[PDB]
Amino acid sequence: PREVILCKDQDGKIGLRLKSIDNGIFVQLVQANSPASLVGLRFGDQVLQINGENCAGWSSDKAHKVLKQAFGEKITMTIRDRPFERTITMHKDSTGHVGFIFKNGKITSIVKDSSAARNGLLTEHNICEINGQNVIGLKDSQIADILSTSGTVVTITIMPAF
Amino acid sequence: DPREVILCKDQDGKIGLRLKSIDNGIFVQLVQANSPASLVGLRFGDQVLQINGENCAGWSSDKAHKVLKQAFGEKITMTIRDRPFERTITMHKDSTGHVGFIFKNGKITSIVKDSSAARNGLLTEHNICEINGQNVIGLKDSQIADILSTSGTVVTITIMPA
Ligand SMILES: CC(=O)c1ccc(F)c(-c2ccc(C[C@@H](C(=O)N[C@@H](C)C(=O)O)N3Cc4cc(Br)ccc4C3=O)cc2)c1
Numbered sequence: 373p374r375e376v377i378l379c380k381d382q383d384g385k386i387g388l389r390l391k392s393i394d395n396g397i398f399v400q401l402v403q404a405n406s407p408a409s410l411v412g413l414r415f416g417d418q419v420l421q422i423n424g425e426n427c428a429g430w431s432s433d434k435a436h437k438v439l440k441q442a443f444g445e446k447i448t449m450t451i452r453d454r455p456f457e458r459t460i461t462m463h464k465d466s467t468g469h470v471g472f473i474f475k476n477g478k479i480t481s482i483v484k485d486s487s488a489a490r491n492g493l494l495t496e497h498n499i500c501e502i503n504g505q506n507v508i509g510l511k512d513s514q515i516a517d518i519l520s521t522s523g524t525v526v527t528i529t530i531m532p533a534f
Numbered sequence: 535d536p537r538e539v540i541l542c543k544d545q546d547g548k549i550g551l552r553l554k555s556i557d558n559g560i561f562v563q564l565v566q567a568n569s570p571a572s573l574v575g576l577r578f579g580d581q582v583l584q585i586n587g588e589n590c591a592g593w594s595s596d597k598a599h600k601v602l603k604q605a606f607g608e609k610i611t612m613t614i615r616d617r618p619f620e621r622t623i624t625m626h627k628d629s630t631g632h633v634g635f636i637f638k639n640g641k642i643t644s645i646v647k648d649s650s651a652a653r654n655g656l657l658t659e660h661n662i663c664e665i666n667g668q669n670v671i672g673l674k675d676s677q678i679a680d681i682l683s684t685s686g687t688v689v690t691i692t693i694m695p696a
């Protein structure tokens with residue numbers, strides 16, 4: 373658990389969208405070049421507390437109601453670094469592929485006798501990083517450009533789509 | 535990193551394991567006490583990458599059991615990824631002897647407000663696997679309650695999404 377302080381920029385907005393998942397509050401959307409982006413907030417981070425109050429059981433509307441109705445331009449948050457994050461290493465075959473089909477940044481299929489198949493890569497998982505580069509927010513064709521310019525080793529970080 | 539385990543059948547060609555297809559992968563759903571599977575370290579939620587050399591990718595629950603049933607000699611080789619969905623949460627009992635969560639069939643279904651569980655971001659729709667190193671998979675709810683009731687102030691629980 374870590375504590376991040378956020379300064380509200382002009383319209384009392386943090387550039388953050390939160391979602392209620394399994395009675396927890398998670399980071400769902402982080403706008404680029406925003407107060408939230410600045411202090412390290414990433415897709416899949418868990419918010420434990422907002423201004424010292426527990427987020428447990430809060431609905432998605434409650435979390436946003438709290439963030440806007442907060443007095444003063446400073447909001448403290450206690451965060452847990454993407455708890456659902458897993459890393460999987462794969463190798464390109466002779467055709468330059470590791471073996472998976474994706475749509476909207478989410479793995480939808482695994483090709484038989486592929487590197488993804490040998491390494492137990494899962495479907496219904498969003499891709500977060502490829503070889504260190506963040507891919508949340510990129511269009512599918514830009515993600516394919518990163519995969520295409522990769523060496524033989526393809527390490528991807530994934531999380532269940534939820 | 536995955537590890538290889540060698541399993542020797544006990545008498546009836548039984549390995550003492552129950553499998554489950556999840557997200558085009560195969561995971562262990564139950565490990566029998568004192569069995570060949572229990573002997574080599576297999577635990578609930580372990581991922582099976584290969585059975586006797588072939589990829590489990592896309593295999594159904596029935597397919598995995600069919601392949602295990604139809605194994606030739608008394609030796610079944612398996613490539614395992616150690617419980618990939620495992621998270622550990624440490625909580626402290628309050629003055630009334632509780633950490634603050636409700637469960638049914640071994641699954642967290644509610645988080646009590648202002649509790650140690652709420653402070654630690656404990657999540658619902660998660661199966662409880664262990665409590666202070668004691669495996670609780672396969673136990674009745676009143677037996678899980680008995681383990682919590684006789685625990686010290688520190689309560690560390692291992693969980694996995696349902
Ligand atoms: C045995 C093995 O490995 C193998 C053997 C033969 C094959 F024809 C393949 C294979 C070839 C191409 C692809 C395409 C696949 C892809 O390039 N995936 C990467 C991650 C990869 O497999 O390396 N993309 C590209 C793409 C772009 C955009 Br815009 C949107 C979606 C996608 C997508 O799913 C998929 C499979 C695979």
Ligand SMILES: CC(=O)c1ccc(F)c(-c2ccc(C[C@@H](C(=O)N[C@@H](C)C(=O)O)N3Cc4cc(Br)ccc4C3=O)cc2)c1
Binds near residue numbers: 630631633635648
């Ligand atoms: C502030 C705080 O903590 C707190 C405040 C007020 C509270 F009324 C509680 C609290 C009291 C009791 C329980 C019961 C709850 C329980 O004992 N859970 C443990 C894990 C715990 O909370 O320590 N079980 C026991 C049980 C047995 C069987 Br059989 C089936 C289901 C369950 C179940 O969910 C739950 C909450 C707690």
